[PDB]
């Protein structure tokens, strides 16, 4: 943290943040969500980290070089240490990236190494080559060298993500799945784990061994698992919570900008809200059924009347304001809703659905005030505009993600936030073999367009290919885009250091501070 001259610091430097749900895990190789990553950034630090405005900056690596964007060499600071006092070395990173790549670890982010094109990753994922064949090596204790199979100019931007953070081999090997328990865990970020009560709280305390410990101000941070946005706001207003989670309650939100205008933060966010269709399951494997659902949803009602929290109606997967995005807005989005409805009805009738045999399916969502109210509204809009019947089903976060990976669903509420600011952070998740592909979409044409983006050596050709890739996705109606999120949350007047300038919202509690109040 960089406390501004003049600021009066509170005597007690503790913070309480809501985290939206109970985490899937605390192991960097077993997580995939925002809640999980919020806690991970405080405990595990990778090669690079984001600064307070979101720029890729020095983490464990203090400096790095690249040769033709294919061989990246990272010089690790010599005072980097784990919470047990032992050094963080290049060997830790070799072990860790090998564990991520290993099929036996079954990470949901195994494909992150394919996104960066580390040499030999495809063969390791497939079981053809051993994980020790991965294109990473320790040149010495403080030098980590990564070899890619082709030039990736934006490679370093990927390195702030939890999947590529280091994990402690000795603890993993001795305790197995219980290595993350408070008594066994070892961490290298600004904090360490003090307590973990499932469905109650996660308490972190300052890590004295952290290399930048002298700049850390907050001594303890608590992360809560409240999935009800209304309850999160209530506990914030009662005084218990200092920072809410960033998913807002339909019931209370508008009241808040009038009631407490200086505490309501609203900033740009590179995330897209959508309804995910299981593409491999009949009758959702029929493009007409998918297109009907896409067109019959009325974005103006939902975005402006139902939710009404600052969002923009979406027509794509990658947010149009992503660095490098130059998207073509489709003609259906410019039409009137009545024209969209007509076309949807015609396509469904062509699909084989009558009124004696209507289309009936499930709509899965994760427990939440926001998602429930929106799902009830969408169910009503689809019934009215298209004559379809939907059965709502709620599941807790960890169960919900599992269901989507397994393919045991019809349609599901979904949302993806960028991991790095570049269109492939979104587009790579729709590749046929991606570990992050929960739409179960497989398109050879789509895959080819993305493969060609690193075959060109200029950004104009690259951006045109990304635009074409979005058109392919839209053509196939892989998903039902709803709106582009905004990062809206409540932050007490006394919480300093939160700028809201980072469109990826990669917050580090080591950068915050409590002002005397």
Short mmCIF file of C-alpha atoms in Angstrom, two decimals:
data_model
loop_
_atom_site.label_atom_id
_atom_site.label_comp_id
_atom_site.label_asym_id
_atom_site.label_seq_id
_atom_site.Cartn_x
_atom_site.Cartn_y
_atom_site.Cartn_z
CA UNK A 1 0.00 0.00 0.00
CA UNK A 2 1.08 3.59 -0.70
CA UNK A 3 -0.57 5.79 1.94
CA UNK A 4 -0.92 9.38 0.73
CA UNK A 5 0.71 12.17 2.71
CA UNK A 6 -1.73 13.60 5.24
CA UNK A 7 -3.95 10.52 5.64
CA UNK A 8 -4.71 9.58 9.25
CA UNK A 9 -4.53 5.80 9.71
CA UNK A 10 -6.95 3.95 11.95
CA UNK A 11 -5.41 2.21 14.98
CA UNK A 12 -6.98 -1.11 13.99
CA UNK A 13 -6.12 -2.20 10.44
CA UNK A 14 -8.65 -4.95 9.76
CA UNK A 15 -11.01 -5.45 6.80
CA UNK A 16 -14.19 -7.44 6.10
CA UNK A 17 -15.09 -8.25 2.48
CA UNK A 18 -18.01 -10.26 1.11
CA UNK A 19 -16.87 -12.87 -1.45
CA UNK A 20 -20.14 -13.93 -3.06
CA UNK A 21 -20.06 -17.66 -2.27
CA UNK A 22 -18.07 -20.46 -0.61
CA UNK A 23 -14.84 -21.07 -2.55
CA UNK A 24 -14.36 -24.24 -4.58
CA UNK A 25 -10.88 -24.64 -3.08
CA UNK A 26 -7.75 -22.76 -1.98
CA UNK A 27 -5.44 -24.81 -4.28
CA UNK A 28 -4.41 -22.68 -7.28
CA UNK A 29 -4.70 -25.66 -9.66
CA UNK A 30 -8.26 -26.57 -8.65
CA UNK A 31 -10.02 -23.18 -9.00
CA UNK A 32 -11.72 -21.24 -11.80
CA UNK A 33 -13.93 -18.45 -10.40
CA UNK A 34 -13.89 -14.83 -9.19
CA UNK A 35 -14.50 -15.71 -5.51
CA UNK A 36 -11.66 -18.26 -5.65
CA UNK A 37 -9.26 -15.80 -7.31
CA UNK A 38 -10.10 -13.01 -4.83
CA UNK A 39 -8.65 -15.11 -1.99
CA UNK A 40 -5.86 -16.59 -4.16
CA UNK A 41 -4.26 -13.19 -4.95
CA UNK A 42 -3.76 -12.56 -1.21
CA UNK A 43 -2.10 -15.96 -0.60
CA UNK A 44 -0.15 -17.05 -3.72
CA UNK A 45 2.04 -14.75 -5.88
CA UNK A 46 3.18 -15.61 -9.40
CA UNK A 47 5.83 -14.16 -11.74
CA UNK A 48 3.92 -10.90 -12.34
CA UNK A 49 1.06 -9.19 -10.42
CA UNK A 50 -1.34 -6.34 -11.30
CA UNK A 51 -0.58 -2.86 -9.87
CA UNK A 52 -3.44 -0.77 -8.36
CA UNK A 53 -4.68 0.31 -11.82
CA UNK A 54 -4.37 -3.13 -13.38
CA UNK A 55 -1.04 -2.91 -15.22
CA UNK A 56 1.08 -6.09 -15.38
CA UNK A 57 3.99 -5.44 -12.95
CA UNK A 58 6.75 -7.25 -11.06
CA UNK A 59 5.72 -10.10 -8.75
CA UNK A 60 8.22 -12.85 -7.83
CA UNK A 61 10.10 -11.88 -11.03
CA UNK A 62 11.76 -8.45 -10.75
CA UNK A 63 12.71 -8.28 -14.45
CA UNK A 64 12.30 -10.32 -17.63
CA UNK A 65 13.31 -10.48 -21.29
CA UNK A 66 12.02 -12.15 -24.44
CA UNK A 67 13.71 -13.46 -27.58
CA UNK A 68 11.39 -13.21 -30.60
CA UNK A 69 8.38 -13.48 -28.22
CA UNK A 70 9.14 -17.24 -27.94
CA UNK A 71 11.76 -17.62 -25.19
CA UNK A 72 10.87 -15.65 -22.05
CA UNK A 73 13.43 -15.35 -19.24
CA UNK A 74 12.37 -14.30 -15.75
CA UNK A 75 14.84 -13.06 -13.13
CA UNK A 76 13.41 -13.90 -9.69
CA UNK A 77 14.10 -11.54 -6.77
CA UNK A 78 16.46 -13.14 -4.25
CA UNK A 79 14.40 -12.27 -1.17
CA UNK A 80 11.20 -14.01 -2.33
CA UNK A 81 10.13 -16.42 0.44
CA UNK A 82 7.34 -18.76 1.55
CA UNK A 83 5.52 -18.27 4.88
CA UNK A 84 7.76 -20.90 6.54
CA UNK A 85 10.84 -18.78 5.77
CA UNK A 86 12.16 -20.87 2.88
CA UNK A 87 13.04 -19.34 -0.48
CA UNK A 88 10.76 -19.23 -3.52
CA UNK A 89 12.87 -20.55 -6.42
CA UNK A 90 12.65 -21.29 -10.14
CA UNK A 91 12.28 -24.97 -9.19
CA UNK A 92 8.97 -24.12 -7.47
CA UNK A 93 7.66 -22.73 -10.76
CA UNK A 94 8.88 -25.77 -12.74
CA UNK A 95 7.07 -28.17 -10.41
CA UNK A 96 3.95 -25.99 -10.31
CA UNK A 97 3.46 -25.53 -14.07
CA UNK A 98 4.14 -29.28 -14.56
CA UNK A 99 1.39 -30.08 -11.99
CA UNK A 100 -1.02 -27.74 -13.81
CA UNK A 101 -0.32 -29.50 -17.13
CA UNK A 102 -0.59 -33.03 -15.73
CA UNK A 103 -3.88 -34.70 -16.67
CA UNK A 104 -3.99 -36.40 -13.23
CA UNK A 105 -4.41 -32.99 -11.54
CA UNK A 106 -7.53 -32.47 -13.66
CA UNK A 107 -7.36 -28.67 -13.42
CA UNK A 108 -10.18 -26.63 -14.97
CA UNK A 109 -7.38 -24.28 -16.09
CA UNK A 110 -5.11 -26.93 -17.70
CA UNK A 111 -5.76 -25.15 -21.03
CA UNK A 112 -4.15 -21.90 -19.73
CA UNK A 113 -0.82 -23.42 -20.85
CA UNK A 114 -2.32 -23.97 -24.34
CA UNK A 115 -3.46 -20.31 -24.44
CA UNK A 116 0.19 -19.31 -23.87
CA UNK A 117 1.50 -22.08 -26.17
CA UNK A 118 4.13 -23.48 -23.79
CA UNK A 119 6.02 -26.13 -25.78
CA UNK A 120 4.67 -29.69 -25.67
CA UNK A 121 1.42 -28.89 -23.81
CA UNK A 122 -1.00 -30.62 -26.22
CA UNK A 123 0.86 -33.95 -25.96
CA UNK A 124 1.07 -33.77 -22.15
CA UNK A 125 -2.66 -33.04 -21.84
CA UNK A 126 -3.40 -36.00 -24.13
CA UNK A 127 -1.16 -38.43 -22.23
CA UNK A 128 1.31 -38.81 -25.11
CA UNK A 129 4.16 -37.10 -23.24
CA UNK A 130 5.01 -36.94 -19.54
CA UNK A 131 4.50 -33.59 -17.73
CA UNK A 132 8.28 -33.30 -17.22
CA UNK A 133 8.49 -32.67 -20.97
CA UNK A 134 6.82 -29.25 -20.55
CA UNK A 135 8.75 -26.32 -22.04
CA UNK A 136 9.84 -24.79 -18.73
CA UNK A 137 13.20 -24.99 -16.95
CA UNK A 138 15.12 -23.50 -14.03
CA UNK A 139 18.46 -22.16 -15.32
CA UNK A 140 19.47 -21.59 -11.69
CA UNK A 141 17.59 -21.04 -8.40
CA UNK A 142 16.54 -17.50 -9.46
CA UNK A 143 16.01 -17.87 -13.22
CA UNK A 144 12.93 -19.37 -14.87
CA UNK A 145 12.94 -19.85 -18.65
CA UNK A 146 9.77 -20.52 -20.67
CA UNK A 147 9.85 -21.78 -24.27
CA UNK A 148 6.78 -21.33 -26.47
CA UNK A 149 5.98 -23.13 -29.73
CA UNK A 150 5.29 -19.82 -31.55
CA UNK A 151 5.55 -16.06 -30.94
CA UNK A 152 3.10 -14.66 -28.37
CA UNK A 153 3.65 -10.90 -27.96
CA UNK A 154 1.13 -10.62 -25.11
CA UNK A 155 2.44 -13.68 -23.20
CA UNK A 156 3.50 -11.80 -20.03
CA UNK A 157 -0.04 -10.42 -19.55
CA UNK A 158 -1.27 -13.96 -18.81
CA UNK A 159 1.10 -14.35 -15.86
CA UNK A 160 -0.99 -12.58 -13.22
CA UNK A 161 -3.60 -15.42 -13.10
CA UNK A 162 -3.90 -17.86 -10.16
CA UNK A 163 -3.33 -20.98 -12.29
CA UNK A 164 0.30 -20.01 -12.91
CA UNK A 165 1.09 -19.17 -9.26
CA UNK A 166 3.49 -21.48 -7.36
CA UNK A 167 2.40 -24.26 -4.96
CA UNK A 168 4.57 -25.88 -2.25
CA UNK A 169 5.63 -29.36 -3.39
CA UNK A 170 6.46 -30.70 0.09
CA UNK A 171 3.04 -29.83 1.57
CA UNK A 172 1.18 -31.12 -1.49
CA UNK A 173 3.10 -34.41 -1.33
CA UNK A 174 2.84 -34.94 2.44
CA UNK A 175 -0.79 -33.94 3.03
CA UNK A 176 -2.42 -34.45 -0.36
CA UNK A 177 -5.85 -32.82 -0.59
CA UNK A 178 -5.60 -31.46 2.98
CA UNK A 179 -2.47 -29.38 2.18
CA UNK A 180 -4.59 -26.19 2.19
CA UNK A 181 -5.82 -26.67 5.78
CA UNK A 182 -4.52 -23.93 8.10
CA UNK A 183 -2.14 -26.28 9.95
CA UNK A 184 -0.53 -27.59 6.74
CA UNK A 185 -0.63 -24.75 4.20
CA UNK A 186 2.43 -22.71 3.13
CA UNK A 187 1.94 -19.42 1.17
CA UNK A 188 4.03 -16.78 -0.64
CA UNK A 189 1.68 -13.80 -1.04
CA UNK A 190 1.20 -10.91 1.42
CA UNK A 191 -1.08 -12.99 3.67
CA UNK A 192 -1.33 -16.46 5.22
CA UNK A 193 -4.37 -18.57 6.15
CA UNK A 194 -5.50 -18.28 9.77
CA UNK A 195 -8.97 -19.83 9.79
CA UNK A 196 -11.34 -21.55 7.34
CA UNK A 197 -14.91 -22.32 8.44
CA UNK A 198 -16.87 -23.66 5.46
CA UNK A 199 -19.95 -21.52 4.82
CA UNK A 200 -19.03 -19.05 7.57
CA UNK A 201 -15.72 -17.30 6.89
CA UNK A 202 -12.09 -17.33 5.72
CA UNK A 203 -9.67 -15.28 7.89
CA UNK A 204 -6.25 -14.24 6.55
CA UNK A 205 -3.40 -12.66 8.54
CA UNK A 206 -0.30 -10.77 7.41
CA UNK A 207 2.64 -12.88 6.16
CA UNK A 208 5.82 -11.49 7.74
CA UNK A 209 8.02 -13.38 5.27
CA UNK A 210 6.49 -11.63 2.23
CA UNK A 211 9.24 -9.78 0.33
CA UNK A 212 7.21 -6.54 0.25
CA UNK A 213 5.84 -6.93 3.80
CA UNK A 214 7.04 -3.46 4.86
CA UNK A 215 4.45 -1.85 2.53
CA UNK A 216 1.48 -4.01 3.66
CA UNK A 217 -0.94 -2.06 5.92
CA UNK A 218 -3.97 -4.31 6.63
CA UNK A 219 -3.10 -6.93 9.27
CA UNK A 220 -6.19 -9.13 8.92
CA UNK A 221 -8.87 -9.57 6.25
CA UNK A 222 -12.02 -11.70 6.50
CA UNK A 223 -13.77 -13.06 3.39
CA UNK A 224 -17.45 -14.03 3.79
CA UNK A 225 -19.47 -16.43 1.61
CA UNK A 226 -22.80 -14.58 1.32
CA UNK A 227 -24.60 -15.34 -1.96
CA UNK A 228 -27.60 -13.10 -1.22
CA UNK A 229 -26.81 -9.60 -2.54
CA UNK A 230 -29.59 -8.12 -0.38
CA UNK A 231 -28.04 -9.72 2.74
CA UNK A 232 -24.57 -8.48 1.73
CA UNK A 233 -25.92 -4.90 1.52
CA UNK A 234 -27.77 -5.28 4.84
CA UNK A 235 -24.60 -6.41 6.68
CA UNK A 236 -22.60 -3.63 5.02
CA UNK A 237 -25.13 -1.01 6.20
CA UNK A 238 -25.29 -2.47 9.72
CA UNK A 239 -21.51 -1.96 9.98
CA UNK A 240 -20.25 -5.56 9.72
CA UNK A 241 -18.99 -5.44 6.11
CA UNK A 242 -16.52 -2.88 4.75
CA UNK A 243 -16.69 -3.86 1.07
CA UNK A 244 -19.59 -5.75 -0.56
CA UNK A 245 -19.17 -8.33 -3.33
CA UNK A 246 -19.76 -6.97 -6.86
CA UNK A 247 -23.08 -8.50 -7.95
CA UNK A 248 -25.96 -6.14 -6.93
CA UNK A 249 -29.40 -6.71 -5.43
CA UNK A 250 -32.39 -5.71 -7.58
CA UNK A 251 -34.47 -5.13 -4.46
CA UNK A 252 -32.20 -2.46 -2.97
CA UNK A 253 -29.74 -1.01 -5.54
CA UNK A 254 -31.47 2.16 -6.84
CA UNK A 255 -32.34 3.23 -3.29
CA UNK A 256 -28.60 3.16 -2.49
CA UNK A 257 -27.37 5.73 -5.05
CA UNK A 258 -29.81 8.25 -3.57
CA UNK A 259 -29.32 7.08 0.02
CA UNK A 260 -25.51 6.78 -0.04
CA UNK A 261 -24.02 8.22 -3.23
CA UNK A 262 -20.39 8.47 -2.08
CA UNK A 263 -20.21 4.78 -1.12
CA UNK A 264 -21.54 3.41 -4.40
CA UNK A 265 -18.64 2.59 -6.76
CA UNK A 266 -19.48 1.91 -10.44
CA UNK A 267 -16.63 1.22 -12.93
CA UNK A 268 -15.97 -0.57 -16.24
CA UNK A 269 -15.65 -4.38 -16.04
CA UNK A 270 -14.54 -6.84 -18.74
CA UNK A 271 -17.21 -9.49 -18.10
CA UNK A 272 -20.24 -10.73 -20.06
CA UNK A 273 -23.54 -12.06 -18.61
CA UNK A 274 -25.11 -14.75 -20.82
CA UNK A 275 -27.32 -17.83 -20.92
CA UNK A 276 -25.14 -20.83 -21.77
CA UNK A 277 -26.70 -23.50 -24.00
CA UNK A 278 -25.48 -27.12 -23.77
CA UNK A 279 -24.57 -27.51 -27.46
CA UNK A 280 -24.11 -31.30 -27.44
CA UNK A 281 -27.59 -32.14 -26.09
CA UNK A 282 -30.74 -32.48 -28.20
CA UNK A 283 -32.70 -30.51 -28.87
CA UNK A 284 -30.10 -27.78 -28.23
CA UNK A 285 -27.82 -29.26 -30.89
CA UNK A 286 -30.23 -27.76 -33.46
CA UNK A 287 -29.09 -24.25 -34.49
CA UNK A 288 -32.70 -23.07 -35.04
CA UNK A 289 -33.60 -23.81 -31.40
CA UNK A 290 -30.55 -21.90 -30.18
CA UNK A 291 -31.22 -18.92 -32.49
CA UNK A 292 -34.89 -18.75 -31.40
CA UNK A 293 -33.85 -18.49 -27.73
CA UNK A 294 -31.22 -15.87 -28.60
CA UNK A 295 -33.62 -13.63 -30.54
CA UNK A 296 -36.75 -13.98 -28.36
CA UNK A 297 -34.96 -12.70 -25.23
CA UNK A 298 -35.76 -8.97 -24.87
CA UNK A 299 -32.57 -7.29 -23.65
CA UNK A 300 -34.22 -3.88 -23.23
CA UNK A 301 -36.76 -5.19 -20.73
CA UNK A 302 -34.20 -7.07 -18.61
CA UNK A 303 -31.27 -4.66 -18.78
CA UNK A 304 -33.34 -1.48 -18.43
CA UNK A 305 -36.56 -2.47 -16.64
CA UNK A 306 -35.86 -5.67 -14.69
CA UNK A 307 -32.25 -5.41 -13.49
CA UNK A 308 -31.52 -1.76 -14.33
CA UNK A 309 -28.11 -1.48 -12.65
CA UNK A 310 -25.90 0.16 -15.28
CA UNK A 311 -25.41 -2.60 -17.86
CA UNK A 312 -25.42 -2.47 -21.65
CA UNK A 313 -27.30 -4.97 -23.83
CA UNK A 314 -24.92 -7.52 -25.33
CA UNK A 315 -24.62 -8.94 -28.83
CA UNK A 316 -21.28 -10.74 -28.43
CA UNK A 317 -19.19 -12.88 -26.05
CA UNK A 318 -16.02 -10.78 -25.95
CA UNK A 319 -16.93 -7.34 -24.54
CA UNK A 320 -16.53 -4.74 -27.31
CA UNK A 321 -14.27 -2.54 -25.14
CA UNK A 322 -11.67 -5.29 -24.62
CA UNK A 323 -8.20 -4.11 -25.71
CA UNK A 324 -7.97 -5.22 -29.35
CA UNK A 325 -11.69 -5.71 -29.92
CA UNK A 326 -13.12 -4.20 -33.12
CA UNK A 327 -16.40 -6.11 -33.41
CA UNK A 328 -19.13 -6.10 -36.04
CA UNK A 329 -22.62 -5.61 -34.53
CA UNK A 330 -25.03 -8.16 -36.03
CA UNK A 331 -28.19 -7.11 -37.86
CA UNK A 332 -30.59 -8.98 -35.54
CA UNK A 333 -29.49 -6.70 -32.66
CA UNK A 334 -30.56 -3.60 -34.61
CA UNK A 335 -34.04 -4.96 -35.35
CA UNK A 336 -37.17 -4.31 -33.32
CA UNK A 337 -38.09 -6.90 -30.67
CA UNK A 338 -41.27 -7.75 -32.58
CA UNK A 339 -39.22 -8.60 -35.68
CA UNK A 340 -36.91 -10.75 -33.51
CA UNK A 341 -39.92 -12.52 -31.96
CA UNK A 342 -41.45 -13.31 -35.36
CA UNK A 343 -38.22 -14.89 -36.59
CA UNK A 344 -37.80 -16.88 -33.36
CA UNK A 345 -41.35 -18.28 -33.57
CA UNK A 346 -40.78 -19.26 -37.21
CA UNK A 347 -37.49 -21.06 -36.42
CA UNK A 348 -38.99 -23.02 -33.51
CA UNK A 349 -41.93 -24.13 -35.69
CA UNK A 350 -39.33 -25.24 -38.24
CA UNK A 351 -37.59 -27.13 -35.40
CA UNK A 352 -40.69 -29.29 -34.83
CA UNK A 353 -42.36 -27.59 -31.88
CA UNK A 354 -46.13 -27.13 -31.86
CA UNK A 355 -48.49 -26.11 -29.03
CA UNK A 356 -49.38 -29.74 -28.29
CA UNK A 357 -45.67 -30.51 -28.03
CA UNK A 358 -44.05 -27.26 -26.90
CA UNK A 359 -40.42 -26.81 -25.95
CA UNK A 360 -39.86 -27.42 -22.23
CA UNK A 361 -36.43 -27.34 -20.56
CA UNK A 362 -34.49 -26.46 -17.41
CA UNK A 363 -32.83 -23.15 -16.54
CA UNK A 364 -30.04 -23.68 -14.00
CA UNK A 365 -28.69 -20.78 -11.93
CA UNK A 366 -26.42 -20.45 -8.87
CA UNK A 367 -28.10 -19.26 -5.64
CA UNK A 368 -28.41 -15.47 -5.76
CA UNK A 369 -31.01 -12.69 -5.50
CA UNK A 370 -29.89 -11.22 -8.81
CA UNK A 371 -29.82 -14.50 -10.76
CA UNK A 372 -33.13 -15.74 -9.36
CA UNK A 373 -35.04 -12.53 -10.21
CA UNK A 374 -33.48 -12.39 -13.69
CA UNK A 375 -34.25 -16.08 -14.34
CA UNK A 376 -37.90 -15.54 -13.34
CA UNK A 377 -38.08 -12.57 -15.74
CA UNK A 378 -36.40 -14.48 -18.60
CA UNK A 379 -38.71 -17.47 -18.05
CA UNK A 380 -41.68 -15.09 -18.40
CA UNK A 381 -40.23 -13.32 -21.47
CA UNK A 382 -39.57 -16.63 -23.27
CA UNK A 383 -43.07 -17.92 -22.40
CA UNK A 384 -44.75 -14.74 -23.65
CA UNK A 385 -42.62 -14.11 -26.74
CA UNK A 386 -41.93 -17.68 -27.85
CA UNK A 387 -44.28 -20.05 -26.02
CA UNK A 388 -41.59 -22.10 -24.26
CA UNK A 389 -41.80 -23.54 -20.75
CA UNK A 390 -38.78 -23.35 -18.43
CA UNK A 391 -38.22 -25.11 -15.11
CA UNK A 392 -35.94 -23.12 -12.76
CA UNK A 393 -33.35 -24.93 -10.63
CA UNK A 394 -30.87 -23.37 -8.15
CA UNK A 395 -27.56 -24.93 -7.06
CA UNK A 396 -24.72 -23.69 -4.80
CA UNK A 397 -21.65 -22.29 -6.65
CA UNK A 398 -19.27 -25.27 -6.45
CA UNK A 399 -22.02 -27.75 -7.42
CA UNK A 400 -23.22 -25.44 -10.22
CA UNK A 401 -19.76 -25.28 -11.86
CA UNK A 402 -19.44 -29.06 -11.62
CA UNK A 403 -22.83 -29.58 -13.28
CA UNK A 404 -21.83 -27.32 -16.18
CA UNK A 405 -18.52 -29.15 -16.77
CA UNK A 406 -20.31 -32.53 -16.68
CA UNK A 407 -22.90 -31.45 -19.25
CA UNK A 408 -25.86 -32.43 -17.03
CA UNK A 409 -27.98 -29.46 -18.05
CA UNK A 410 -30.11 -27.77 -20.70
CA UNK A 411 -29.56 -24.00 -20.33
CA UNK A 412 -27.57 -22.30 -17.57
CA UNK A 413 -27.00 -18.74 -16.34
CA UNK A 414 -23.33 -17.94 -17.08
CA UNK A 415 -20.66 -15.25 -16.92
CA UNK A 416 -17.01 -14.93 -17.93
CA UNK A 417 -14.55 -12.24 -16.83
CA UNK A 418 -11.23 -11.67 -18.66
CA UNK A 419 -8.04 -13.16 -17.19
CA UNK A 420 -5.83 -10.88 -19.31
CA UNK A 421 -6.94 -7.86 -21.39
CA UNK A 422 -6.92 -9.30 -24.93
CA UNK A 423 -9.72 -10.93 -26.96
CA UNK A 424 -8.24 -14.46 -26.77
CA UNK A 425 -8.89 -14.42 -22.99
CA UNK A 426 -12.55 -14.87 -23.98
CA UNK A 427 -12.25 -16.57 -27.40
CA UNK A 428 -9.91 -19.37 -26.23
CA UNK A 429 -12.64 -20.76 -23.92
CA UNK A 430 -14.79 -21.73 -26.92
CA UNK A 431 -12.04 -23.81 -28.60
CA UNK A 432 -13.23 -27.44 -29.00
CA UNK A 433 -10.65 -28.85 -26.57
CA UNK A 434 -10.57 -26.08 -23.95
CA UNK A 435 -10.83 -27.11 -20.28
CA UNK A 436 -12.91 -23.92 -19.77
CA UNK A 437 -15.50 -24.84 -22.45
CA UNK A 438 -18.76 -25.40 -20.55
CA UNK A 439 -20.92 -24.63 -23.60
CA UNK A 440 -19.62 -27.91 -25.03
CA UNK A 441 -19.26 -26.12 -28.36
CA UNK A 442 -17.00 -27.70 -31.00
CA UNK A 443 -16.43 -25.84 -34.28
CA UNK A 444 -13.51 -26.62 -36.61
CA UNK A 445 -14.08 -23.30 -38.41
CA UNK A 446 -13.99 -21.38 -35.11
CA UNK A 447 -10.84 -23.22 -34.01
CA UNK A 448 -9.09 -22.43 -37.31
CA UNK A 449 -9.80 -18.67 -37.13
CA UNK A 450 -8.21 -18.52 -33.65
CA UNK A 451 -5.22 -20.66 -34.72
CA UNK A 452 -4.51 -18.14 -37.49
CA UNK A 453 -4.26 -15.17 -35.08
CA UNK A 454 -0.68 -16.08 -34.10
CA UNK A 455 0.24 -16.89 -37.71
CA UNK A 456 0.01 -13.18 -38.64
CA UNK A 457 2.54 -10.61 -37.32
CA UNK A 458 0.36 -7.50 -37.02
CA UNK A 459 -2.54 -6.38 -34.83
CA UNK A 460 -4.82 -5.20 -37.68
CA UNK A 461 -5.02 -8.69 -39.18
CA UNK A 462 -5.29 -10.16 -35.67
CA UNK A 463 -8.25 -7.92 -34.76
CA UNK A 464 -10.06 -8.77 -38.02
CA UNK A 465 -9.73 -12.49 -37.23
CA UNK A 466 -11.14 -11.94 -33.71
CA UNK A 467 -14.13 -10.12 -35.25
CA UNK A 468 -14.67 -13.05 -37.65
CA UNK A 469 -14.47 -15.51 -34.74
CA UNK A 470 -17.26 -13.64 -32.92
CA UNK A 471 -19.32 -13.72 -36.15
CA UNK A 472 -18.83 -17.50 -36.32
CA UNK A 473 -20.00 -17.89 -32.71
CA UNK A 474 -23.04 -15.70 -33.42
CA UNK A 475 -23.79 -17.54 -36.68
CA UNK A 476 -23.93 -20.80 -34.75
CA UNK A 477 -25.81 -19.21 -31.83
CA UNK A 478 -23.44 -20.89 -29.37
CA UNK A 479 -24.67 -18.66 -26.52
CA UNK A 480 -27.40 -16.15 -25.60
CA UNK A 481 -25.62 -12.85 -24.79
CA UNK A 482 -27.56 -10.71 -22.26
CA UNK A 483 -25.49 -7.71 -21.06
CA UNK A 484 -21.94 -6.51 -20.36
CA UNK A 485 -21.42 -6.21 -16.59
CA UNK A 486 -20.36 -3.09 -14.71
CA UNK A 487 -18.26 -3.36 -11.52
CA UNK A 488 -20.73 -1.98 -8.96
CA UNK A 489 -20.13 -2.40 -5.21
CA UNK A 490 -20.34 -0.51 -1.92
CA UNK A 491 -17.09 0.60 -0.25
CA UNK A 492 -17.04 2.38 3.15
CA UNK A 493 -15.66 5.92 3.16
CA UNK A 494 -12.71 4.82 5.34
CA UNK A 495 -11.42 2.15 2.91
CA UNK A 496 -8.48 3.58 0.96
CA UNK A 497 -6.56 2.21 -2.03
CA UNK A 498 -9.48 0.97 -4.14
CA UNK A 499 -9.39 2.98 -7.36
CA UNK A 500 -11.72 0.85 -9.51
CA UNK A 501 -9.41 1.68 -12.45
CA UNK A 502 -8.62 -1.95 -13.28
CA UNK A 503 -11.20 -3.36 -15.71
CA UNK A 504 -10.31 -6.89 -14.52
CA UNK A 505 -10.79 -5.96 -10.83
CA UNK A 506 -7.65 -7.78 -9.67
CA UNK A 507 -7.63 -6.39 -6.12
CA UNK A 508 -4.83 -7.13 -3.64
CA UNK A 509 -5.56 -6.41 0.07
CA UNK A 510 -1.84 -5.52 0.50
CA UNK A 511 -2.67 -2.31 -1.44
CA UNK A 512 -5.54 -1.11 0.83
CA UNK A 513 -5.60 0.80 4.13
CA UNK A 514 -8.06 1.96 6.80
CA UNK A 515 -8.45 5.71 7.37
CA UNK A 516 -9.18 6.90 10.92
CA UNK A 517 -12.94 7.22 11.44
#
